[PDB]
Amino acid sequence: FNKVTAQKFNGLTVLPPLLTDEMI
Amino acid sequence: QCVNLTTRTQLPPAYTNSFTRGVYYPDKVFRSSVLHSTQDLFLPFFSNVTWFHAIHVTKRFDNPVLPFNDGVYFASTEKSNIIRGWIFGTTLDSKTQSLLIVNNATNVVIKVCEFQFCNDPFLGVYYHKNNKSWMESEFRVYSSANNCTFEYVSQPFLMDLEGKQGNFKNLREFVFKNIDGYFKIYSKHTPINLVRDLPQGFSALEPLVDLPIGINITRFQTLLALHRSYLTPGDSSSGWTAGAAAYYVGYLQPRTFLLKYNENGTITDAVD
Amino acid sequence: LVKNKCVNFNFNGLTGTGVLTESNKKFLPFQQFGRDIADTTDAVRDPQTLEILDITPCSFGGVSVITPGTNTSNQVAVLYQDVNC
Amino acid sequence: QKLIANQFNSAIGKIQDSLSSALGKLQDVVNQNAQALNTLVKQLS
Amino acid sequence: CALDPLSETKCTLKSFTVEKGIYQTSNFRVQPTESIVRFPNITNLCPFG
Ligand SMILES: *[C@@H]1O[C@H](CO)[C@@H](O)[C@H](O)[C@H]1NC(C)=O
Numbered sequence: 109f110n111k112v113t114a115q116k117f118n119g120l121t122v123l124p125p126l127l128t129d130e131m132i
Numbered sequence: 133q134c135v136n137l138t139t140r141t142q143l144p145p146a147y148t149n150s151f152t153r154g155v156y157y158p159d160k161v162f163r164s165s166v167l168h169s170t171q172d173l174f175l176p177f178f179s180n181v182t183w184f185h186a187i188h189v190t191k192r193f194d195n196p197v198l199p200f201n202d203g204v205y206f207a208s209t210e211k212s213n214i215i216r217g218w219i220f221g222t223t224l225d226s227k228t229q230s231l232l233i234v235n236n237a238t239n240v241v242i243k244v245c246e247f248q249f250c251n252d253p254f255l256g257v258y259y260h261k262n263n264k265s266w267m268e269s270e271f272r273v274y275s276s277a278n279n280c281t282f283e284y285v286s287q288p289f290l291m292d293l294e295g296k297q298g299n300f301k302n303l304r305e306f307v308f309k310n311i312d313g314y315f316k317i318y319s320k321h322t323p324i325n326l327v328r329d330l331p332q333g334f335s336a337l338e339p340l341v342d343l344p345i346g347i348n349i350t351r352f353q354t355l356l357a358l359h360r361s362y363l364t365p366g367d368s369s370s371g372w373t374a375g376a377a378a379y380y381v382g383y384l385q386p387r388t389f390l391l392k393y394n395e396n397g398t399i400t401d402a403v404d
Numbered sequence: 405l406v407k408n409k410c411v412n413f414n415f416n417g418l419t420g421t422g423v424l425t426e427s428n429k430k431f432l433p434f435q436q437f438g439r440d441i442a443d444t445t446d447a448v449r450d451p452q453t454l455e456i457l458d459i460t461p462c463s464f465g466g467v468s469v470i471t472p473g474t475n476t477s478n479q480v481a482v483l484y485q486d487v488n489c
Numbered sequence: 490q491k492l493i494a495n496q497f498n499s500a501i502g503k504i505q506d507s508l509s510s511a512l513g514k515l516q517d518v519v520n521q522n523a524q525a526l527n528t529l530v531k532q533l534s
Numbered sequence: 535c536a537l538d539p540l541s542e543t544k545c546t547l548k549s550f551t552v553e554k555g556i557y558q559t560s561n562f563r564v565q566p567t568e569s570i571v572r573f574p575n576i577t578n579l580c581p582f583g
């Protein structure tokens with residue numbers, strides 16, 4: 109999780125997925 | 133009023149190399165943790181730059197009329213505050229709007245007018261007998277002035293009028309640009325202990341105030357100050373002294389540069 | 405001077421609509437605006453008392469309607485994407 | 490059985506020591522989306 | 535399409551029946567009701583008394 113790594117200011121919002129990292 | 137000089141033995145200017153010099157703030161916005169590039173007038177690294185001397189020990193006094201290009205780089209490892217001011221213009225015959233930015237011992241003046249610039253303007257510092265202090269008395273920069281419009285006074289700055297022959301302790305860089313008629317002044321003081329072959333350190337240059345005159349500048353010339361002690365007879369013909377100074381004249385080229393911004397927001401590195 | 409609401413200001417260089425939150429970073433005394441990594445002016449220094457404020461928009465995303473299906477119910481629910489309540 | 494159990498524990502420690510020293514397939518999918526989002530803000534300029 | 539979210543679902547999908555699932559009807563934009571313009575801090579009047 110720590111090995112692999114605002115944009116929403118211009119209407120480019122990022123939607124969250126259905127399943128988070130805890131359920132995966 | 134001004135006087136003429138007498139022919140004597142001079143020293144020819146040398147050519148040295150720069151080491152990561154000529155980096156200033158390209159805008160008036162804040163940047164942090166972003167690698168952004170812009171297209172402005174900067175100085176290319178490891179380029180051939182001119183070198184002019186001002187140390188007396190002989191009688192070195194070289195102040196020619198160099199052409200002013202789009203952005204210059206004036207770096208001076210000043211120790212005793214020998215270089216006072218700078219002049220600008222095209223023909224220097226009371227025909228255009230000449231510039232006069234002289235750092236005096238009382239206050240900094242910015243007076244763009246039609247002054248009568250002579251062949252060689254210089255300030256003279258006379259040493260009094262009863263007073264053990266160096267005072268400026270020969271104020272020979274121009275002859276007269278008829279009429280002009282703009283006149284601005286800057287913040288007061290204290291200077292040392294005593295000239296020595298020791299090593300330098302400070303370094304001052306000046307960048308003069310002209311875009312759309314606007315004048316830009318980038319000045320920053322940085323202490324260093326060196327006489328020549330500038331180090332590879334990094335230091336940003338912060339501007340002070342924008343001067344919107346709106347004229348064209350094609351030539352420029354620096355002003356040097358001399359001292360009049362009891363060793364010299366006091367005539368500006370063949371016997372004089374100037375202390376020790378060294379200024380670098382560089383021309384900024386239109387090259388894109390990549391800057392590095394930390395969490396503080398200051399410039400750390402520059403990549404051409 | 406008002407803060408912490410979706411307001412509109414014109415600080416000599418832009419007309420943006422958003423909020424003005426109290427930042428924790430002090431700027432250098434020669435700048436007026438501030439960009440970021442995403443190339444967006446979201447930090448404008450207030451010329452009143454040199455108070456650094458951040459810009460965050462108030463319109464984020466849109467709405468959403470939840471329908472259980474036909475022959476099941478009649479009421480729905482309103483879902484916001486990235487709008488805090 | 491004690492030989493393969495020791496070889497299995499040595500194989501896990503070799504993967505853990507190699508992964509602690511970045512991945513390629515999990516980084517190109519993020520760098521391509523980050524450059525595409527940074528391009529859309531540049532289109533407004 | 536501007537009265538009920540259930541009726542907004544049917545006309546935007548162009549179907550009189552709705553099955554189970556998520557949909558997007560419109561957006562939510564917050565309109566500011568006030569505007570401030572402050573270029574200087576205090577207009578320093580020159581002495582004219
Ligand atoms: C520069 O950033 C460091 C790291 O947070 C901080 O501790 C320091 O106070 C900052 N300096 C200034 C002048 O803000």
Ligand SMILES: *[C@@H]1O[C@H](CO)[C@@H](O)[C@H](O)[C@H]1NC(C)=O
Nearest residue numbers: 473474475476477550551552
């Ligand atoms: C009633 O609900 C059932 C679902 O079990 C559906 O199959 C049927 O079509 C519905 N009736 C009508 C009239 O839509």
Ligand SMILES: *[C@@H]1O[C@H](CO)[C@@H](O)[C@H](O)[C@H]1NC(C)=O
Nearest residue numbers: 408409410423486487488489
């Ligand atoms: C949403 O707003 C409320 C009240 O303004 C606040 O208490 C809450 O912390 C906010 N939510 C987030 C995630 O910041």
Ligand SMILES: *[C@@H]1O[C@H](CO)[C@@H](O)[C@H](O)[C@H]1NC(C)=O
Nearest residue numbers: 450451452453454574575576
């Ligand atoms: C504006 O005036 C206030 C109070 O007179 C002062 O605190 C502030 O620094 C000023 N802003 C400037 C000079 O940008």
